[PDB]
Amino acid sequence: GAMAPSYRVKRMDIAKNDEECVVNAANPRGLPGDGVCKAVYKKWPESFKNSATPVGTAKTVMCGTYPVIHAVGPNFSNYTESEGDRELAAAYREVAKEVTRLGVNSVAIPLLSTGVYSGGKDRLTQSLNHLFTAMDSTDADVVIYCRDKEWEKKISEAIQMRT
Ligand SMILES: c1ccc2[nH]ncc2c1
Ligand SMILES: [Cl-]
Ligand SMILES: [Cl-]
Ligand SMILES: [Cl-]
């Protein structure tokens, strides 16, 4: 575990992370995809061997010795708000299990279902609160990666609020 487990946020490409493992915002079919998923495919293509897994689950594949945790959030274009919320919570619980199993002291994580799976809605708060519910009982240093300058401020504020 980390000596004083923390949450941090960085605005940069998760493919350049400084953590002991990475969470991919995966599709269920283990396809290269776009956004976070395509950057992850370009950096760790070996991790996409038999990475396909259902919605609400996480599947780890090693790229050398570096773990890639493929976490499949719901596409809110297809799910109801209620069912989507349940699957988004579940995907993060499966990430917490994998992070624990791997024995890593740090993890880079994107906000699941906030991009092309968002169904055109702002899900920063919904996705971040499910991230916290899952990861609060783990002792890994968590570093959340985002792209948008206003999202960085709001994630930083949410972390600071609970400290
Ligand atoms: C992908 C490419 C460039 C980027 N700059 N900040 C976040 C990010 C993600
Ligand atoms: Cl970058
Ligand atoms: Cl997404
Ligand atoms: Cl973002």
From Swiss-Prot:
ADP-D-ribose binds at D13, N27, G35, G115, V116, Y117. Phosphorylated by host on serines and threonines. Changing V36 to E/F: Almost complete loss of mono-ADP-ribosylhydrolase activity. Changing D13A: Partial loss of ADP-ribose 1'' phosphate phosphatase activity. Residues 4-163 form the Macro domain. Seems to be essential for minus-strand RNAs and subgenomic 26S mRNAs synthesis. Displays mono-ADP-ribosylhydrolase activity. ADP-ribosylation is a post-translational modification that controls various processes of the host cell and the virus probably needs to revert it for optimal viral replication. Binds proteins of G3BP family and sequesters them into the viral RNA replication complexes thereby inhibiting the formation of host stress granules on viral mRNAs. This is Non-structural protein 3. It comes from Chikungunya virus (strain S27-African prototype). The lineage of its organism: Viruses, Riboviria, Orthornavirae, Kitrinoviricota, Alsuviricetes.
